[PDB]
Write a protein that binds this DNA or RNA. Structure first.
Lengths: 111, 89, 108, 72, 62, 66, 930
RNA sequence: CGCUUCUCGGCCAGUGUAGUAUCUGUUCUUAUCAGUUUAAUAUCUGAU
């Protein structure tokens, strides 16, 4: 159990193409899948979503049939929350929904 | 001048030349190979297909890690494809 | 038929600290017209001098014969001066006037 | 310090040699080998009277009638 | 030393030596100006002179 | 080291060090299923409301900086 | 000053316009250009007077030219006369001054003190001790400058280097070093270099664009170190004006600069700049550059270009349509390079590019044309073989019509294309067989090509891939007949080509008759070798090992040549034939031609008296591989004969010998090892021992492993007793290999035997052998692992003594022992002691001595896994906040190392901490009690 | 090459990259305060 190393939350596409995996914080990686020559499951090489100082509440596979896939990282930044001597940023931050988007052709993953 | 690339660890098997051949990469050592090397095709590509993870020659074999670096769990950090001071590629 | 490095300047050394522009101008005067001269007058550069001519081939004839030439009891180190280096103590500015001038008279 | 003649023949092995009989005959070919009696094995040897034949293969030349050996 | 110099973030203060500046940076008052300014201490901000630039640098930090 | 969070240096403040170990306490508590269930039992809630609460307390703990 | 700078540029070209126009109307009607006293106060440094001797003096000067022709033609000649000196001129230096260099180091022709800056310049001639002198001088002086970095400051330095890194006559070694100084001081100065940055690149960039491979890589290294070292906006604001600089050279290079600075600071930092450039509407020359930049970015950043791919391209498209040509040209060229880093990716990002490209293909004449190919070709792999299908089918035409050009840029291009076009899965076999081949082998395979380097390679590749498709016999059939063409490099080429092909495709396809033509060939080539080259040799080996028992009828002709050659032809060619045996051993075996094995065994055996090293080496090699096929007890020179026959060779000094020998001795003393009576061995031991003077690693490598093999044959005590005596004078870690013997030995019978001998031998007062025994334990535990669960006790007190000081080295090496032990034991339950030792370790924590420290870091890391954190952390609490800096530095470095691993464990082990006013440091959770 | 004599023997000053350790020589225990600096000193920076 780490703070930064994935395996905590786990999500995966309807079409099974690719699967996203994430820690709680800072790391979201993605493994792509395609069945082999004989249709036996071959695993891609990883990728990276990294974004600093960001809390991932929960992640969920998304539905787009045969597209570049999407994912939902529920997030929050705490970086506002540190550099606020007061304790205002403690409140008055809202957790940020972001959809990441795998993109095969380019093969990186973009907010 | 000579230090790691530590880009993310892919599925690509490592490749070592004649010279480097015995060496557990980080512990520098021949002892007790057990487990296997992975680097990013970013680090490992093309002219680097079967290239030495050290010297820039053709890979004749596959670096095995020691056990020593194993229990200290270092093999799982960024891909040990050494970049020299000059453009690695 | 010439090496590119050599330039209208020569570094010139092994001089006495009494020595005369009269001597100098005369001797060097052989090969060709003097653009001008400098003499190190300063705590370090006392003893050396620069020489520059209206032509290189002038100077070529110079470093040719004057090579190791004698004055008094000393053999003068005779060298083609380097360049670039420390000059930028000045700046290139003062085009504007002049190039307006060629801009003007000849109209070109 | 002395240069032995058999040592001189030894080093011309695998080279081209001219072998000059005591007669008016001569052979040039590659020196393959020799014995103590200086019988001689030549390869692809031209035979001359001072061109008689082009030999192909190996010739044993009887050391008996040999007079001069010439490397080259 | 004894060469004219100035730190902008500290009271537009004057310093007479370049070796002196590093010592000033690892200093009580210099870090008080940074931290009380909202620019947190130690080693990223060492090369600071003016107050302005390290503000965008600290925005780059957080 | 730097891009690996929780790294310290000799300038490390009291406050930061402790907030660190808070957070890590948490990703453990979300981690170790049982430990979690322990909490749940004691103070009566859902598993969920636990994890939720925690993930609130993540950025805060100890309250504002100094 | 920047604005000023560019002002000076627009100046410069306005001037060239004035002159060039002056000879434009003057032609309607350089360095020698006359000078002004401001211009004349511009060159020479500070500190010189101009003169006048006299207006009569300077009048004769004014008279000089007119009287240079005039008095060039007049009377003179010079007459010597036959007839207490002084004044010894002071020249040279400890590393000495070349004659030319006087100009730089002149101020070391003065001898003074009491001048202050000038004492810093006059002290910076430490350079000369860099530039010339002895190696040690270079070293020490070099550091002395490094730590004097901050102090003198860049300004004085670069003021005093760049002349030398500009030296018309500067040495290559001198170059590379003076680079070393520029890097090294650039590890330090950061903010400092700003005013100097351009004033650096101007020297360096030439180096980056460098014929020498190692030159370049240095260059890039430092241009990053600078660019990252300086600031981004520094780099930019610096380097615009070189873009439009008249000289294409400085542009060209200026690009590769921007390539590097971009590898440093990332593309996206720099994009909006580029993207600005390619939309510059003033002039094209820029755009020619900016595009180039895109390229060299492509090449350098390579596989990593991927993400901003789309943006980059979104720059470059607006070129292809341009009115100017080059800009088209270079542009497309970039697209190529992109794709070549793109590989099979980002296809549609290139997407909007194509449709011009294809059209462009049609209408062209010239270098540009084939360039567009260079692209498309690198595209096709990226398409869908249905879309790619179509588009392919269009190209292979133009490709056809274009084989024939005289241009070489061309033939490279169209070549690499075919690799890709017909290098495809979705292309049909026959079609190649018909249209392409006959041209292909026609125009390309010619002697123009192979003499050149690249074309050689690129060719081989291409032909290979046409094999991977249309089959083997097709190709090889057509190029066999050329092994017997005379000139070498050509032959070499056909040879390697084939070698690969029967590499990939396999021999199995080849017919018969053709095959006769092979082996007849591959001898005929092999019989004539200008140098000895791996090519024909390997190429052969592969030939055979592919043909397998199809080969068998051909031996007698082989081994016949193998011997014949083997002899004579004088010795240079010998080693070759030797190797030839080396590789074909396996084939001589399984087919069971034993008379052959009689032949080889024995006749090689004779040569082992050959005096040339470079034969005997290859000879043994052959022997080794001969052993790996026929077992010991069937060896025709039965080992008893052999192995001693080797034995005396080991003096041989020369390399290749020592290698193949010790190798051989090893195999045999491993495998048979009974054949030879013990006495002989112990002679072998006392001969091995000084093989440990080997400059080389591999020798010592197998050397050791042998030392073990025999140590098995005999039994331990002696062989360590004997090793105890050895390696007395090994220099700086040279002997260690002996220690490695103590180790491996100590395994290969129960170490549980050997210790008492060893331990006791740490008694001896001689210091360095003491530490020796310590390492012995080190490698020892590293090699034993689990087993340590016993003898641990034995060492522990000893580790206490050694670990307590005599000197550092004791603590260093010993501590290492703690490491490898601490891992090996793991979790069998012997911690207690290891805790105990932890104490005597601990204080060592503090030191600057790099080896001692990285040693200790070794220790405590391992010890962590053995003891567990909680104990460790209980040494690391107090340290964190200790007022001093020194301690906090370290206890933090430790606590990190504890921290990264086993972060998951800790939670338990942070102690309770009382909450203050603004905050709560007590984690209340854990105290919830059911 | 053979024989005879005598002597002896065998068997039943390399190099390269990085880095530390350790002697000796030379200078200072010496006036106040203000800043930089240090765990505290020290050290460094100004004037009477």
């Amino acid at each position: 159990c780490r703070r930064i190393v994935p395996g905590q939350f786990l999500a995966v596409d309807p079409k099974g193409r690719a699967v996203m995996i994430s820690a709680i914080e800072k790391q979201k990686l993605v493994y792509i899948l395609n069945r082999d020559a004989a249709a036996r499951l071959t695993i891609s090489s990883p990728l990276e979503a990294h974004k600093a100082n960001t809390l991932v509440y929960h992640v969920v596979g998304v539905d787009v049939g045969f597209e570049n896939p999407m994912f939902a990282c529920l997030e929050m930044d705490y970086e506002e929350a540190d550099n606020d001597p007061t304790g205002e940023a403690a409140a008055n931050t809202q957790q940020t929904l972001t959809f990441y988007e795998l993109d095969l052709g380019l093969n990186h993953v973009v907010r | 001048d000579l230090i790691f690339c530590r880009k993310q660890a892919g599925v690509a098997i490592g490749r070592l030349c004649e010279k480097c051949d015995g060496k557990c990469v980080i512990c520098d050592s021949y002892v007790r190979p057990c487990t296997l090397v992975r680097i990013c095709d970013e680090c490992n590509y093309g002219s680097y297909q079967g290239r030495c993870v050290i010297c820039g020659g053709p890979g004749v074999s596959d670096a095995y890690y020691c056990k020593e670096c194993t229990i200290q769990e270092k093999d799982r950090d960024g891909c040990p494809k050494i970049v020299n001071l000059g453009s690695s590629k | 038929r010439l090496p590119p490095e050599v330039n209208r300047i020569l570094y010139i050394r092994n001089l006495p600290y009494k020595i005369t522009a009269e001597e100098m101008y005369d001797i060097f005067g052989k090969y060709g017209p003097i653009r001008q001269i400098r003499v190190g007058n300063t705590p370090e550069t006392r003893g050396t001098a620069y020489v520059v001519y209206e032509d290189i081939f002038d100077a070529k004839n110079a470093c040719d014969h004057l090579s190791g030439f004698n004055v008094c009891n000393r053999y003068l180190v005779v060298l083609y001066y380097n360049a670039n280096r420390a000059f930028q103590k000045m700046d290139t500015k003062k085009k504007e006037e002049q190039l307006k001038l060629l801009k003007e008279k000849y109209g070109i | 310090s002395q240069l032995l003649p058999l040592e001189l023949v030894d080093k011309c092995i695998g080279s081209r040699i001219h072998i000059v009989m005591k007669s008016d005959k001569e052979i040039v070919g590659t020196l393959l080998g020799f014995d103590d009696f200086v019988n001689m094995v030549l390869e692809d040897v031209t035979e001359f009277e001072i061109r008689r034949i082009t030999k192909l293969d190996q010739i044993l030349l009887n050391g008996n009638n040999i007079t001069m050996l010439v490397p080259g | 030393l004894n060469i004219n110099y100035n730190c902008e973030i500290c009271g537009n203060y004057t310093y007479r030596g370049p070796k002196a500046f590093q010592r000033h940076f690892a200093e009580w008052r210099h870090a008080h100006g940074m931290r009380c300014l909202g620019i947190p201490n130690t080693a990223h901000f060492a090369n600071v002179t003016q107050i302005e630039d390290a503000v965008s640098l600290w925005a780059k930090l957080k | 080291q730097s891009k690996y969070i929780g790294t310290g240096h000799a300038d490390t403040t009291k406050w930061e060090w402790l907030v660190n170990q808070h957070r890590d306490s948490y990703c453990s508590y979300m981690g170790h299923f049982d430990l979690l269930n322990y909490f749940a039992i004691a103070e009566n809630e859902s598993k969920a409301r636990v994890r939720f609460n925690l993930m609130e307390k993540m950025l805060q703990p100890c309250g504002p900086p100094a | 000053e920047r604005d000023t700078p560019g002002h000076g540029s627009g100046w410069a070209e306005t001037p060239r316009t004035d002159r060039g126009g002056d000879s434009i109307g003057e032609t309607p009607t350089e360095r020698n250009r006359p000078l002004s006293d401001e211009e004349l106060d511009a060159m020479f440094p500070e500190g010189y007077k101009v003169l006048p001797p006299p207006a009569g003096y300077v009048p004769i000067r004014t008279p000089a030219r007119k009287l240079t022709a005039t008095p060039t033609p007049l009377g003179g000649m010079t007459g010597f006369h036959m007839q207490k000196s002084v004044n010894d001129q002071p020249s040279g230096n400890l590393p000495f001054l070349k004659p030319d260099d006087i100009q730089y180091f002149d101020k070391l022709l003065v001898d003074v003190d009491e001048s202050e800056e000038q004492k810093e310049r006059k002290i910076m001639k430490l350079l000369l001790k860099i530039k010339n002198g002895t190696p040690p001088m270079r070293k020490a002086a070099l550091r002395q400058i490094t730590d004097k970095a901050r102090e003198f400051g860049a300004g004085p330095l670069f003021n005093q280097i760049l002349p030398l890194l500009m030296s018309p006559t500067l040495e290559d070694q001198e170059r590379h070093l003076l680079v070393k100084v520029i890097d090294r001081i650039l590890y330090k100065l950061d903010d400092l270099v700003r005013p100097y940055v351009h004033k650096i690149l101007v020297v360096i960039e030439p180096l980056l664009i460098d014929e020498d491979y190692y030159a370049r890589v240095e260059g890039r290294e430092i241009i990053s170190n600078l660019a990252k070292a300086a600031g981004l906006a520094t780099m930019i604001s610096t380097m615009r004006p070189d873009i439009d600089n008249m000289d294409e050279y400085v542009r060209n290079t200026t690009a590769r600069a921007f390539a590097v600075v971009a590898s440093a600071l990332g593309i996206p930092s720099l994009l909006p700049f580029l993207k600005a450039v390619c939309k510059s509407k003033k002039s094209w020359q820029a755009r020619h550059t900016g595009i180039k930049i895109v390229q060299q970015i492509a090449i350098l950043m390579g596989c990593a270009i991927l993400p901003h791919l789309r943006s980059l391209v979104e720059i470059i498209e607006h070129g292809l349509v341009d009115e100017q040509q080059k800009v088209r040209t270079i542009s497309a060229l970039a697209i190529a390079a992109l794709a070549e880093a793109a590989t099979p990716y980002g296809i549609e990002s290139f997407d909007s590019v194509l449709k011009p490209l294809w059209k462009g293909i049609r209408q062209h004449r010239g270098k540009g044309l084939a360039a567009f190919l260079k692209a498309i070709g690198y595209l096709i792999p990226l398409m869908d073989a249905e879309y790619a299908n179509y588009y392919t089918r269009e190209v292979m035409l133009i490709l056809i019509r274009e084989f024939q050009s005289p241009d070489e840029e061309m033939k490279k291009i169209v070549l690499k294309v075919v690799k890709q076009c017909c290098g495809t899965d979705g292309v049909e076999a026959n079609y190649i067989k018909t249209e392409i081949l006959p041209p292909f082998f026609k125009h390309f395979w010619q002697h123009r090509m192979a003499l050149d380097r690249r074309n050689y390679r690129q060719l081989v590749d291409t032909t290979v891939e046409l094999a991977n498709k249309v089959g083997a016999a097709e190709i090889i059939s057509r190029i066999v007949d050329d092994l017997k063409d005379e000139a070498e490099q050509y032959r070499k080429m056909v040879m390697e080509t084939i070698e690969k092909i029967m590499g990939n495709l396999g021999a199995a396809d080849i017919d018969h008759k053709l095959e006769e033509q092979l082996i007849d060939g591959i001898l005929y080539a092999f019989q004539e070798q200008t140098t000895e080259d791996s090519v024909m040799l390997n190429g052969f080996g592969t030939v055979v090992n592919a043909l397998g028992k199809r080969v068998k009828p051909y031996l007698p002709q082989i081994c016949g040549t193998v011997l014949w050659r083997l002899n004579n032809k004088s010795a240079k060619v010998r080693q070759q034939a030797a190797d030839l045996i080396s590789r074909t051993a396996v084939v001589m075996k399984t087919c069971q031609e034993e008379k052959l094995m009689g032949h080889l065994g024995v006749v090689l055996y004779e040569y082992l008296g050959e005096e040339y090293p470079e034969v005997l080496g290859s000879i043994l090699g052959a022997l080794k591989a001969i052993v790996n096929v026929i077992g010991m007890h069937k060896m025709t020179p039965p080992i008893k004969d052999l192995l001693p026959r080797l034995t005396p060779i080991l003096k041989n000094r020369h390399e290749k010998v020592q290698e193949n020998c010790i190798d051989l001795v090893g195999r045999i003393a491993d495998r048979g090892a009974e054949y030879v009576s013990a006495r002989e061995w112990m002679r072998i031991c006392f001969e091995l021992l000084e093989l440990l003077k080997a400059h080389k690693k591999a020798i010592r490598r197998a050397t050791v492993n042998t030392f073990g093999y025999i140590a098995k044959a005999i039994g331990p005590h002696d062989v360590l007793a004997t090793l105890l005596n050895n390696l007395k004078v090994q220099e700086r870690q040279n002997r260690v290999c002996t220690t490695v013997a103590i180790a491996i030995v100590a395994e290969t019978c129960s170490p549980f035997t050997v210790l008492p001998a060893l331990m006791n031998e740490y008694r001896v007062p001689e210091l360095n052998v003491q530490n020796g025994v310590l390492k012995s334990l080190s490698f020892l535990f590293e090699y034993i692992g689990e087993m340590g669960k016993d003898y641990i006790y034995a060492v522990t007190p000893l580790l206490e003594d050694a670990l307590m000081d005599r000197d550092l080295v004791h603590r260093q090496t010993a501590s290492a022992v703690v490491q490898h032990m601490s891992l090996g034991v793991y979790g069998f339950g012997c911690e207690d002691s290891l805790n105990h030792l932890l104490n005597y370790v601990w204080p060592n924590v503090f030191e600057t001595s790099p080896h001692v420290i990285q040693a200790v870091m070794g220790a405590l890391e391992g010890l962590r896994v053995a003891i567990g954190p909680c104990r460790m952390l209980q040494y690391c609490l107090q340290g964190l906040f200790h007022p001093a800096r020194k301690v906090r530095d370290v206890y933090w470095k430790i606590y990190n190392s504890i921290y990264i691993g086993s972060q998951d464990a800790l939670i338990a082990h942070y102690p309770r901490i009382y909450n203050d006013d603004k905050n709560t440091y007590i984690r209340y959770e854990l105290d919830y009690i059911l």
